[PDB]
Design a protein around this ligand. Structure first.
Ligand SMILES: *C(=O)[C@@H]([C@@H]1NC(C(=O)O)=C(S[C@@H]2CN[C@H](C(=O)N(C)C)C2)[C@@H]1C)[C@@H](C)O
Length: 498
């Protein structure tokens, strides 16, 4: 009785108007088997025109002989569709439909996602913003005799309303740079999987989100399953040392600690009841707060955690969004877990403090660094272009955030620091770490320009079979290269000036 009139699906562009998902006209062929059944001699030419086996085609028509609508083929070009319609096969009609094509392809596959056969969002932005993008389908009334001769297509019951254009937060230029550099780093280190997230610290915008391995959304016939995984939003891990700047934020906000305060960590181990906290680097006695970060001392961070209490640490981590909902409403996005133990024994206090007491995603870690870089102000995450920036929330006092930024600038720039993360022409800040899932990931989280932050970035490189990945060796060089390129693409003035 009714045949739907598909609506033009809204265009998806990057933030600069570059096309990412385009509704393109296609011609679909359908048939009324009751009418096709009267023209059996035409079937082989029809089957041959559709590149279909004559018998498989005949069986399909015979098996559907009492039906009034079946699809023959979907998604042909207008010219191909016209050519078959030009054979004048009785009971064979055409529907002008729309099919999504993804011009940037594998470069932004997970972020954009894709639609199903019926042009409905199935993954990523296509799904998250399906109501905005879809539009309203039309309706046409088909009236036939008491069998299969089309008596009336009388009218169109309702016209189609097209979907709405959507500009993503993604900057395809930064996305391409991140994609290329993550693939390069994976090949260099013998790694197979990873993610790279770039964020605008002032606006909450996700400027880049790339996952390796990736896939071509235009050709989804039996791909590798690992390729489909949106790692940045789905791979949950214990962030480890990358959350020590948050434990430091709690220490500075407690009123008990100043950056020049000292902690004795010798001999790089600390016994707490039956348990032993151990530092990987064990060449220290007295360290200031910046030194605890540079040497990544678990003993140093744990002693501070015992002094200030785990409640203060848990609260900073919860306030910056670690193990919390992002509010993006992105399909398949995971939350992780930040356990609120209410009362923490010494062992749980220490493990929380050096980041093995919680599980987060790369997106949550990048959002947490954005808050720190944005002078302690958290702006809601956005996968769409943000024109009017929300007020956000002051989650870390501006004083504490500015102090920790300076400590992280020293982690990158000071003697003995993560020098492979330095960005020529700029001052940069960040912290390397080894994530845990035991499966490991090499991490670098940071932001730049260090003295007036604009961009936050997280690099996650998955550690294969055997260890040996140090975040400072593996992920830090990727941060340097992508950050150098992203700041220049954004015309951010160099801050490393005399
Ligand atoms: C945190 O993730 C763990 C520590 N964090 C780091 C780090 O700084 O990435 C280290 S590695 C330690 C510090 N610098 C040395 C280094 O980078 N190499 C010699 C290459 C060794 C620890 C793994 C923490 C939870 O133990």
């Amino acid at each position: 009785r009714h045949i739907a009139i598909p609506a033009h699906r809204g265009l998806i562009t990057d933030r600069n108007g570059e096309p990412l998902a385009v509704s393109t006209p296609v011609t679909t062929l359908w048939a009324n088997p009751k009418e096709l059944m009267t023209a059996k001699e035409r079937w082989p030419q029809l089957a041959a025109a559709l590149g279909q086996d004559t018998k498989l085609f005949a069986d399909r028509i015979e098996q559907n002989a009492e039906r009034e609508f079946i699809y023959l083929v979907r998604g042909l070009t207008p010219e191909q569709g016209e050519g078959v319609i030009a054979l004048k096969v009785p009971g064979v009609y055409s529907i002008e439909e729309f099919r999504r094509f993804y011009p940037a392809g594998e470069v932004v596959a997970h972020a954009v996602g894709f639609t199903d056969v019926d042009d409905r969002g199935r993954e990523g932005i296509e799904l998250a913003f399906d109501e905005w993008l879809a539009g309203v389908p039309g309706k046409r009334q088909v009236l036939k005799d008491r069998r299969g001769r089309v008596i009336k297509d009388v009218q169109v019951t309702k016209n189609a309303k097209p979907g709405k254009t959507l500009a993503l937060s993604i900057d395809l230029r930064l996305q391409y740079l991140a994609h290329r550099e993550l693939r390069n780093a994976l090949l260099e280190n013998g790694a197979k999987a990873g993610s790279l997230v770039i964020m605008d610290v002032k606006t909450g915008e996700i400027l880049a989100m790339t996952n390796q391995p990736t896939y071509n959304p235009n050709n989804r016939r039996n791909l590798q399953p690992a390729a489909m995984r949106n790692r940045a939003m789905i791979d949950v891990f214990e962030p480890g040392s990358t959350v020590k700047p948050f434990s430091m934020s709690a220490a500075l906000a407690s009123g008990r600690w100043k950056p020049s305060d000292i902690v004795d960590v010798y001999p790089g181990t600390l016994q707490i009841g039956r348990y032993t906290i151990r530092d990987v680097s064990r060449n220290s006695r007295q360290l200031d707060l910046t030194g605890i970060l540079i040497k990544s001392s678990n003993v140093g961070i744990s002693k501070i955690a015992f002094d200030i209490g785990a409640e203060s640490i848990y609260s900073v981590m919860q306030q910056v969004g670690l193990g919390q909902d992002t509010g993006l409403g992105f399909p398949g996005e995971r939350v992780g877990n930040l356990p609120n133990h209410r009362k923490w024994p010494k062992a749980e206090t220490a493990t929380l403090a050096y980041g093995y007491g919680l599980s987060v995603t790369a997106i949550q870690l990048a959002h947490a660094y954005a808050a720190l870089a944005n002078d302690g102000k958290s702006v809601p995450l956005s996968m769409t272009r943000v024109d009017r920036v929300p007020d956000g929330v002051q989650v870390i006092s501006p004083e504490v955030a500015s102090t920790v930024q300076g400590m992280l600038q020293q982690v990158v720039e000071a003697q003995g620091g993560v020098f492979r993360a330095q960005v020529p022409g700029y001052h940069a800040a960040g912290k390397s770490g080894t994530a845990r899932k035991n499966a490991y990931r090499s991490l670098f989280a940071g932001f730049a320009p260090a003295t007036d932050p604009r961009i936050a970035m997280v690099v996650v490189i998955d550690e294969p079979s055997k260890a040996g990945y140090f975040g400072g060796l593996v992920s830090a060089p990727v941060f340097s290269k992508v950050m150098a390129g992203a700041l220049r693409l954004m015309n951010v003035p160099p801050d490393n000036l005399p």
